[PDB]
Design a protein around this ligand. Structure first.
Ligand SMILES: Nc1ncnc2c1ncn2[C@@H]1O[C@H](COP(=O)(O)OP(=O)(O)O)[C@@H](O)[C@H]1O
Ligand SMILES: [Ca+2]
Ligand SMILES: [Mg+2]
Ligand SMILES: [Mg+2]
Lengths: 766, 138, 153
């Protein structure tokens, strides 16, 4: 409406038989105009450069008419194929529009730039608006889930998915920021909520090649509502924080954000409280990979993080307990060495100091853990890391418990709206325990997403009056789930293997095959490389979205935390009040089990709304698209079992050639074809506008389609062979006579010359 | 015929040496030898037995005419030929004709084949069936 | 099972053939196709070999005694209707208006299904006197109708 609020929000010669989508290497798909067919070899012209080329006929993709340019809802397009979709998105995207619907799914394409579409001005306009009423936006998705929870009286939920660096986090925050700005009744509840991100992100995010602010833990946040439909509380759940980044960081990557905040001098006053020299490149544990971060001011982020601890309602001691324990870690890694002896004590004291324990009693229970048992020079430097990691894990866990303290207002709750921000399936060169955990997670999520897809399925088996019955579904899914979670599963084996100090990477590996090799087909010996640099693999799992070769080396300590039960005693009675609680008075897998089930029974009590984030390119630059990558994501988003569906119009055209001696309306023609073929009423169903073929059947029709079409072609060639033969039939009777003349009439002149009389006659002649 | 006859007579004349208006074993033997090798008694014998009674210029023309009987025209044959001369060039390609006669219809034999082509007018690959139809006819 | 006037017809034709590959009361099994192709029928090469046909001459010759059943056989075999030829040809028409180009039609005949030599093609084209327009296209409907028609309509 010329309205400033809709600048980056509102959308600003075609022959349906010539124009189409042809594969491309640079653009993924190219706008083509057909020139000439030739069996399968179609010859098209590229509209862009005006060059020419051929393309298999079955590789052409149907184009949509200019009628659906930058369409807001893709379900309304004539053609929904990988090339129509990618074109629509990319069309909108390069114009500022990053939000697009497609059925019940919202699509967000990372902008890599700030957009004036989240203002309070804009929020005003989206309030109580029905999705079709106003441009596509994330607010609309949020605003709608609200209305449903209210009117429908049930819990809502948004699963915001996508690849790493897509927009999962940014969008999760905007949803809360939204719901906070319209259902609002130290600071206010609403204010604290928004403020929990800055602290959790400081402690659980880090620069990665993919994301400068990569979330390294799973986040499920529920937002409760009261009897007047206003925010009356909220809780947070986190999953699988990357314990490993604490002490290690691959090149071009940083450790968690805090560590760098802490060494910037945003609050000089604190330098002496933590005993830190404002230099990050000074501490080994955090200068391995990167130090700075294009577009992240550690100075200001530290301030805001400090500022956020206040609003969260953190006593000054509490928030100084945090800062110290984390600065303590910075030092744990400065303790040098030389059974082993120390190589100084300066840095090892600052540590004992900040944690309120005796530096003596420390290095003691660290170099000869107590019945005693001394440790060598590495057994130590590695238990140092075991300690750093374990502290930070407890810190992060306590931290969340505390921020929930601030938010669990005992007010009156009706229903809620959760938001899920987790990383999905991922297969790398090398996969270990971390991945199995993420993957196991995504599997149970799949079952969920499927359960719902299947419900919309039946919403169709009724919009056409074609009720189907018992199908064949997710058995392979449950097979994987069970292989990992059930009583004797993978994890259960590992869990019972940790409790044994004797155990190792081989008794665990053997104890595994011992149980599932050949007794469960999902478990298969490691195959062969499908990607270079493919590190070790000990077994493979067939996950819904891929086959993953898992290396089980080190899985025993990963699951159980190997810190001197000795130092746990020291800290058990430390002076610092926080440290004391962290090591007060059930392994990763065990915690995550109970955890996942919690989230699931929760999710299964909701009416889900799905948002799909998409990273436009690997360069972090705005408005630029990488079709391959994009296409790659579109690949398998939101299959496998559901019957085939066909519009009689496209069905008649493709399967008439299977009973043409019965075709004198597209819906009756097919009634005939499929009838002629004496097709089992089972393997298919009616429909008002479309045909439903049980599974596989359509593949088999394309079988008969190819065979019959070949025969018929032969039969017309036979017809041509028989025509040409019969045409030359007269010519073959005449010649049969014309030859008998010559044959009988030469044999005469031949025998007449062998006649005495004639001989003698011929002689006289002259 | 009328010119076929004119010859027959003048012939019968040169053959009928003892100018007695009849052809005898001595008549044949006589003239043959005056030209090329002549037939042996047996040849001469059955050569005459081919004529019921005395050989006047009548039983002569009789057996000769009953030989040349049961054959077609020079036009009828020249056509049974052009029946394989699609382009109407008035010539047949030698490999073709030889092939036809050799193993098609009432297959000829090598001898029938040699006897036939020993005369045949083939020059330039093409066997002129016109000239050869004449040679074989009038 | 055939009728007399029918079996007589097999007889009639058997001669014209058995004569041309050297008269002797036997026909080269490599011609068994063309024989039946003369009595109306148009079996498919796949069809013919099934009953006794051969890929080459000389391979073997056959009497009229063994011939009767080859024709009894090639009778019960499927013949293509107009529907079928129309159906299949439609699958090559993107326009949907009963057209095709010469070049493509050529491809269908020579390249797909039991191929057809390049000669038989230029042949039947010229026979049926099929003609292309300025764009070089032809109404496949007309063509199918002629081929179906016969050499003498
Ligand atoms: N809606 C958005 N507006 C502007 N920038 C965004 C938006 N979404 C993502 N980004 C950019 O891309 C980065 C990755 O987004 P993020 O949500 O953290 O990804 P992830 O899917 O891993 O959670 C952000 O740091 C930001 O720079
Ligand atoms: Ca023969
Ligand atoms: Mg994230
Ligand atoms: Mg005499």
């Amino acid at each position: 409406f010329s309205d400033p609020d809709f600048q980056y929000l509102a959308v600003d010669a075609f022959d349906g038989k010539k124009n189409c989508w042809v594969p491309d290497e640079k653009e993924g798909f190219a706008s083509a105009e057909i020139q000439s067919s030739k069996g399968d070899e179609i010859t098209v012209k590229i509209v862009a450069d005006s060059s020419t080329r051929t393309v298999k006929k079955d590789d052409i993709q149907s184009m949509n008419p200019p009628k659906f340019e930058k369409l807001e809802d893709m379900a309304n397009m004539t053609y929904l194929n990988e090339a129509s979709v990618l074109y629509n998105l990319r069309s909108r995207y390069t114009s500022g529009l990053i939000y697009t619907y497609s059925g019940l799914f919202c699509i967000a394409v990372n902008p890599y730039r700030r957009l004036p579409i989240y203002t309070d001005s804009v929020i005003a306009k989206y309030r109580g608006k029905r999705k079709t009423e106003i441009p596509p936006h994330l607010f609309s998705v949020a605003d709608n889930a609200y209305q449903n929870m209210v009117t429908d009286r049930e819990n809502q939920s948004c699963l915001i998915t996508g690849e790493s660096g897509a927009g999962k986090t940014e969008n999760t925050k905007k949803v809360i920021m939204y719901l906070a700005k319209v259902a609002c009744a130290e600071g206010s509840l609403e204010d604290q909520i928004i403020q929990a991100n800055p602290v959790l992100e400081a402690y659980g995010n880090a620069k990665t090649t993919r994301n400068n602010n990569s979330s390294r833990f799973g986040k499920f946040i529920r937002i409760h509502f009261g009897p007047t439909g206003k925010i009356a509380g909220a809780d947070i759940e986190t999953y699988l924080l990357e314990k490993s980044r604490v002490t290690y960081q691959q090149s071009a990557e940083r450790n968690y954000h805090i560590f760098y905040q802490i060494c910037s001098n945003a609050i000089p006053e604190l330098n002496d409280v933590m005993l830190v020299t404002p230099d990050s490149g000074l501490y080994s544990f955090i200068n391995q990979g990167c130090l700075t971060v294009d577009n992240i001011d550690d100075v200001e982020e530290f301030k805001l993080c400090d500022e956020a601890f206040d609003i969260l309602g953190f006593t000054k001691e509490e928030k100084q307990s945090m800062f110290k324990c984390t600065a303590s870690i910075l030092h744990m890694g400065e303790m040098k060495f030389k059974q082993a002896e120390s190589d100084g004590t300066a840095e090892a004291e600052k540590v004992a100091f900040l944690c309120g324990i005796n530096a003596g009693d420390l290095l003691k229970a660290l170099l000869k853990p107590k019945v005693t048992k001394g440790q060598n020079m590495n057994q130590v430097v590695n238990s140092v890391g075991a300690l750093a990691k374990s502290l930070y894990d407890r810190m992060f866990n306590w931290l969340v418990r505390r921020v929930n303290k601030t938010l669990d207002t005992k007010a009156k709750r009706n229903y809620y709206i959760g938001v899920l921000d987790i990383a999905g399936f991922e297969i790398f060169d090398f996969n270990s325990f971390e991945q199995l955990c993420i993957n196991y997670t995504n599997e149970r999520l799949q079952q969920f997403f499927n359960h719902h897809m299947f419900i919309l399925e039946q919403e169709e088996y009724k919009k056409e009056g074609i009720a189907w019955e018992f199908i064949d579904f997710g058995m392979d899914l449950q097979m994987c789930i069970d292989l990992i979670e059930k009583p004797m599963g993978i994890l259960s084996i590992l869990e019972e293997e940790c409790m044994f100090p004797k155990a190792d990477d081989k008794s665990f590996q053997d104890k595994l095959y011992q149980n599932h090799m050949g007794k469960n087909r999902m478990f298969t010996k490691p195959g062969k490389p499908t990607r270079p640099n493919q590190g070790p693999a000990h077994f493979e799992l067939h996950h819904y979205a891929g086959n993953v070769p898992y290396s089980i080396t080190g899985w025993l300590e990963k699951n159980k935390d190997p810190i001197n039960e000795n130092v746990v005693a020291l800290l058990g009675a430390s002076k610092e009040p926080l440290v004391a609680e962290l090591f007060k008075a059930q392994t990763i897998s065990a915690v995550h089990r109970e955890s996942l089930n919690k989230l699931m029974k929760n999710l299964y009590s909701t009416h889900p709304h799905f948002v799909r984030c998409i990273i436009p390119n690997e360069l972090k630059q705005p408005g630029l698209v990488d079709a391959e990558l994009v296409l790659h994501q579109l690949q398998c988003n939101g299959r496998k079992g559901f019957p085939s569906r066909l519009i009689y119009s496209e069905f008649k055209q493709r399967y008439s050639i299977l009973a043409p001696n019965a075709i004198p309306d597209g819906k009756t023609v097919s009634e005939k074809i499929l009838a002629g073929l004496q097709m089992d009423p089972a393997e298919y169903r009616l429909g008002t506008t479309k045909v439903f073929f049980k599974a596989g059947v359509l593949g088999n029709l394309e079988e008969m389609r190819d065979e019959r079409l070949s025969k018929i072609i032969s039969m017309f060639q036979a017809h041509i062979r028989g025509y040409l033969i019969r045409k030359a039939y007269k010519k073959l009777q005449d010649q049969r006579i014309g030859l008998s003349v010559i044959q009988r009439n030469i044999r005469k002149w031949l025998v007449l010359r062998n006649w005495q009389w004639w001989k003698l006659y011929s002689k006289v002649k002259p | 015929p009328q010119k076929q006859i004119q010859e027959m007579k003048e012939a019968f004349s040169m053959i009928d040496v003892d100018r007695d208006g009849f052809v005898s074993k001595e008549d044949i033997k006589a003239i043959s030898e005056q030209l090329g090798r002549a037939p042996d008694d047996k040849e001469l014998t059955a050569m005459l037995k081919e004529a019921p009674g005395p050989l006047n210029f009548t039983m002569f023309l009789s057996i000769f005419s009953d030989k040349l009987s049961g054959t077609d025209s020079e036009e009828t044959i020249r056509n049974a030929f052009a029946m394989f001369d699609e382009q109407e060039t008035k010539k047949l390609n030698i490999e073709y004709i030889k092939d036809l006669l050799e193993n098609m219809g009432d297959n000829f034999n090598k001898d029938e084949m040699r006897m036939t082509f020993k005369e045949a007018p083939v020059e330039g690959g093409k066997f002129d069936y016109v000239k050869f139809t004449a040679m074989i006819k009038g | 099972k055939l009728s007399q006037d029918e079996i007589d017809d097999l007889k009639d034709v058997f001669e014209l053939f058995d004569f041309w590959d050297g008269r002797d009361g036997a026909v080269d099994a490599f011609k068994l196709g063309d024989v039946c192709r003369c009595l109306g029928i148009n079996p498919r090469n796949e069809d013919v070999f099934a009953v006794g046909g051969t890929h080459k001459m000389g391979e073997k010759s056959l009497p009229f005694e063994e011939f009767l059943p080859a024709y009894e056989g090639l009778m019960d075999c499927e013949q293509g209707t107009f529907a079928d030829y129309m159906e299949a040809f439609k699958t090559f028409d993107r326009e949907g208006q009963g057209f095709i180009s010469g070049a493509e039609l050529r491809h269908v005949l020579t390249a797909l299904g039991e191929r057809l030599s390049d000669e038989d093609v230029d042949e039947i084209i010229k026979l049926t006197d099929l003609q292309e327009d300025l764009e070089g296209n032809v109404k496949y409907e007309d063509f199918v109708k002629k081929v179906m028609a016969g050499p003498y309509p």
